[PDB]
Amino acid sequence: TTFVALYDYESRTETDLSFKKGERLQIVNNTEGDWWLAHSLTSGQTGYIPSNYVAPS
Amino acid sequence: TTFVALYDYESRTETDLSFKKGERLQIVNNTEGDWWLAHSLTSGQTGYIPSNYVAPS
Structure with a gap:
């Protein structure tokens, strides 16, 4: 349920964390x-795409 | 390997498709x-976070 960051990440957009x-x-x-x-x-x-919007062919 | 879009999606950032x-x-x-x-x-x-940067607790 809870994850731990392995690395540092710097946001590249307004939407990333x-x-x-x-x-x-x-x-x-x-x-x-x-x-x-x-x-x-x-x-x-x-x-990038939201995966609930697509389905396999 | 190939997916089909079920719905229309309009990008909200410079990085989405x-x-x-x-x-x-x-x-x-x-x-x-x-x-x-x-x-x-x-x-x-x-x-949003890139999931390869984290691991379960």
């Missing part, structure tokens, strides 16, 4: 699901 | 792992 090695973090369950880095074969664009 | 219902998307494996929404019990802050 900065944290330091050793911090205790809990996961927030939400409707979007885990986010994945994805490439659209249809548009050519690439970026 | 917009796509339309029906688009075919492939997952990009990378060092960060899936991203999770997380709450730091230590700082109080909340946002």
Whole structure:
């Protein structure tokens, strides 16, 4: 239920969370699901997607 | 290996990927792992984290 940071992370956007090695973090369950880095074969664009919006082919 | 979008998604940041219902998307494996929404019990802050940076307590 609780995770521990193994490394320091500095936020790169307004939406990520900065944290330091050793911090205790809990996961927030939400409707979007885990986010994945994805490439659209249809548009050519690439970026993160909410995994509850997609399904395997 | 290939996923299909079930819904339309509009990007909210410079890092997410917009796509339309029906688009075919492939997952990009990378060092960060899936991203999770997380709450730091230590700082109080909340946002997305790269899951390869943490481990269960």
